[PDB]
Structure 1
Amino acid sequence: ADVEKHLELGKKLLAAGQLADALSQFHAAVDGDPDNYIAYYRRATVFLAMGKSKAALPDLTKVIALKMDFTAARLQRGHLLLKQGKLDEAEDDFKKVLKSNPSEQEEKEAESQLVKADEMQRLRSQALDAFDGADYTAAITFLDKILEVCVWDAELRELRAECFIKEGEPRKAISDLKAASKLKSDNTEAFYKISTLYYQLGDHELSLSEVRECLKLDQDHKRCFAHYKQVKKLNKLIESAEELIRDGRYTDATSKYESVMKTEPSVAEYTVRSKERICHCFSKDEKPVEAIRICSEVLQMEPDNVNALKDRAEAYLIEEMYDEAIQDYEAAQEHNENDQQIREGLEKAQRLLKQSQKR
């Protein structure tokens, strides 16, 4: 009777669009009578209207537990399961809807959802099959299709991410893993994986804070911890080096980047990036011979590295090799038409050249 009054009010409030207030009434009704099946149903239609399926599901399955013939609630759960990619359980729900005297509308909705589930069910086999056969591009194709419908399927999301890492597309993989993490709570393994991918990418900082998220969920995570110790060190070293170059302490910065390559010799990006900064160090410390040797090395690997070009240029000028200095500025300027810093140096190199040419 208090329950009934709460139920009635909630219906009015729901009809009027006052969702939170409707929710409150249906909560009160459920609390007033924990066995009443419609109370849980009413509350679930409110969560559904808000679009909070995480909250709706337990109430939907409660209703079904209490009232197995309650076709409307089972139809709704079937929808959520299909979206979650729980294909077997979805089909099971839709199929049982068909056999519990559905209204005409419910019958059409369930038949429509059984056609689609069966498509997904077929596509899932093709996706898993292509993956087991190490055909990662075929797999993505199928997963693309599946994930359009099964949008809250965390594991197929992660499987597509695996495809992307294998396909040499780590940034795409990070993105799928991030999306997946928003759908699942147990995220430790995904956070670990993204932190790793950042690491291999050279993004030491994001790698570090990403591994911190892992340790925040589980402090004892052995793999996450072992990697934390590695990035933490590798990251402090780079932070120290950049701090040293800020204060003009070039030989200590060189020394610092030397140990940066020591502590991570496998991942190419850390030597290449370290060499670039060392190239910068020798240049700014006005030590031209060494500057041109290693700025050249960097440039062997990265012919378009603007910083290396500018720094080698600056080193050529000490050596009074004006022709080589301008040629390096021109290469840098080629893709950086508007960069004021390149212009200044090129025009400087040209003034110095003229000076020497005066008679």
Structure 2
Amino acid sequence: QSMADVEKHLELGKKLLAAGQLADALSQFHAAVDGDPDNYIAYYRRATVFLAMGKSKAALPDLTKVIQLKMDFTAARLQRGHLLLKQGKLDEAEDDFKKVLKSNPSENEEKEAQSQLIKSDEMQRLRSQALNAFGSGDYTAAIAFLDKILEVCVWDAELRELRAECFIKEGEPRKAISDLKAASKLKNDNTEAFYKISTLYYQLGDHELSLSEVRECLKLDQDHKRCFAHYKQVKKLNKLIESAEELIRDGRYTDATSKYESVMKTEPSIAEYTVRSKERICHCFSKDEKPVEAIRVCSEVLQMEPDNVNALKDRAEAYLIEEMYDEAIQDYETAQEHNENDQQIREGLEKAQRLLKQSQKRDYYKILGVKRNAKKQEIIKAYRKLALQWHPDNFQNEEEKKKAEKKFIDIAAAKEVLSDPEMR
């Protein structure tokens, strides 16, 4: 009987782990475990790969099987203790940590075991303090407690969740993502955990992520009436925004604008969706050279976010097409306060201020200038007419008159200022 298959599985398995493979190492140790359910080494190796990869649930059962099989082998009960601690299942961990110091206590192990029950004895104390502050209603308090507790028990989902809840109760919902993602990772098959986060990503408009998560919820359970419900939603909503963006890449702005209005229409509750939608619309008009509307919208946007860099920038490019430099600069200058080194913002000013000066100094060819660097005789030709034309004698009413004077003052101003050394 060549039980090589079960043997090779382990060799190949161990080499893979050693190479850093984990994923494949595991595919192998699974083989060995189903190969010889009775063997203890396998259960150990699988368990070590679970651990290596961030998988806490999956490892525990594999460790305790080892214990049961080779009841003697203590490093394993020590391994269990660690896990149960990373898990924050403190009582169970202590009860294991002690039976290590008690049954086959020895060498370096004694130190590890002992130093851990000290963390554990403070942890036990810390969760109480945390759960205290929370129950009584102090969130900021309980946050700081949990922060620490979570350095030692990195894989304690129930607490992470609680911490996440603190953040959101404190109105810092973006901070909760971190914990909620983890919590779902940890439990691996918890239907309500995936909702919890997907729901959150969604509130924050992280709509792409939200969708992948709720896919998960469903991959676990086809029939969840509530995951599905949410899924129809994000799908529809992502489909639209992902579509809109592609149209903004093709410069089909008007089409993108339409798209984004159906976006607001589909998700009208959450502010973040109308806002970001509007931003892009303000962007859509701007890049489409429709400045009036561009201005109209970016105004609404900066009203909700005066610090919205993109919005400022696009509305600036619009002011340009209208030649409103005092405004355009003011905007870039506001965006400056937000981005110190962004080339787009820096280059904004330099282009604008350049044009600002050339605008301030009035042009003479502006009055006619049939040719840039027109011949001195050709100039006089149209001047005679425009001197004939723009003389206040030509029309009766004063209001009009005063206005032509300005043209007259200038038409002649050209003459003296262009002939002789002047002009260049």
TM, length-normalised to structure 1: 0.74
Against the structure 1 CA distance between its residues 194 and 6, is the aligned structure 2 distance closer, same or farther, given a 3 Å change threshold?
Answer: closer
2:317–2:328 CA contact under 8 A, matched in 1? yes
CA distance in 2, matches of 1:168, 1:209: 25
Shift of residue 228, structure 1, vs aligned partner: 1.5
2:57–2:187 CA contact under 8 A, matched in 1? no
CA distance in 1, matches of 2:59, 2:138: 38
CA distance in 2, matches of 1:99, 1:111: 11
CA distance in 1, matches of 2:16, 2:317: 74
Shift of residue 42, structure 1, vs aligned partner: 11
CA distance in 1, matches of 2:347, 2:338: 16
CA distance in 2, matches of 1:100, 1:210: 46
Against the structure 1 CA distance between its residues 317 and 162, is the aligned structure 2 distance closer, same or farther, given a 3 Å change threshold?
Answer: same
Against the structure 1 CA distance between its residues 269 and 358, is the aligned structure 2 distance closer, same or farther, given a 3 Å change threshold?
Answer: farther
Against the structure 1 CA distance between its residues 138 and 37, is the aligned structure 2 distance closer, same or farther, given a 3 Å change threshold?
Answer: same
Matched, 1:144 2:147: yes
Against the structure 1 CA distance between its residues 314 and 87, is the aligned structure 2 distance closer, same or farther, given a 3 Å change threshold?
Answer: closer
Name the stretch that deviates more: 89-98 or 115-124: 89-98
Aligned residues: 359
Shift of residue 85, structure 1, vs aligned partner: 1.9
Name the stretch that deviates more: 337-346 or 30-39: 30-39
2:57–2:186 CA contact under 8 A, matched in 1? no
CA distance in 1, matches of 2:313, 2:20: 64
Shift of residue 6, structure 1, vs aligned partner: 15
Q: Deviations over 1:39-66 (max 9, x none)?
A: 9899989999999987875465346557
Q: Deviations over 1:64-115 (max 9, x none)?
A: 5578788776555444433322222233334556765856987776665545
Q: Deviations over 1:328-354 (max 9, x none)?
A: 233334544544434554444445545
Shift of residue 154, structure 1, vs aligned partner: 2.6
Shift of residue 289, structure 1, vs aligned partner: 2.8
Against the structure 1 CA distance between its residues 290 and 9, is the aligned structure 2 distance closer, same or farther, given a 3 Å change threshold?
Answer: closer
CA distance in 2, matches of 1:318, 1:14: 63
Number of the residue aligned with 1:115: 118
Against the structure 1 CA distance between its residues 172 and 358, is the aligned structure 2 distance closer, same or farther, given a 3 Å change threshold?
Answer: farther
Structure having the higher Rg: 2
CA distance in 2, matches of 1:274, 1:308: 12
Name the stretch that deviates more: 26-35 or 344-353: 26-35
CA distance in 1, matches of 2:261, 2:25: 65
CA distance in 1, matches of 2:14, 2:251: 72
Shift of residue 163, structure 1, vs aligned partner: 2.1
Shift of residue 225, structure 1, vs aligned partner: 1.6
For residues 99-110 of structure 1, the aligned pairs below 5 Å read none
CA distance in 2, matches of 1:252, 1:13: 52
CA distance in 1, matches of 2:9, 2:317: 80
Shift of residue 121, structure 1, vs aligned partner: 1.9
Shift of residue 221, structure 1, vs aligned partner: 2.6
Against the structure 1 CA distance between its residues 280 and 62, is the aligned structure 2 distance closer, same or farther, given a 3 Å change threshold?
Answer: closer
Against the structure 1 CA distance between its residues 319 and 47, is the aligned structure 2 distance closer, same or farther, given a 3 Å change threshold?
Answer: closer
Against the structure 1 CA distance between its residues 26 and 102, is the aligned structure 2 distance closer, same or farther, given a 3 Å change threshold?
Answer: farther
TM, length-normalised to structure 2: 0.64
DSSP-derived class of the 1:183 partner: helix
Against the structure 1 CA distance between its residues 340 and 27, is the aligned structure 2 distance closer, same or farther, given a 3 Å change threshold?
Answer: closer
2:218–2:227 CA contact under 8 A, matched in 1? yes
2:215–2:231 CA contact under 8 A, matched in 1? yes
Number of the residue aligned with 1:294: 297
Number of the residue aligned with 2:423: 358
Pairing partner for 2:183 from 180, 183, 186: 180
CA distance in 2, matches of 1:253, 1:62: 59
Against the structure 1 CA distance between its residues 36 and 3, is the aligned structure 2 distance closer, same or farther, given a 3 Å change threshold?
Answer: same
Note the residue ranges of structure 1 that are not aligned, 5 or more in a row. none
Q: Deviations over 1:233-284 (max 9, x none)?
A: 1112212322333333333322222221121222221111111122222333
Name the stretch that deviates more: 13-22 or 100-109: 13-22
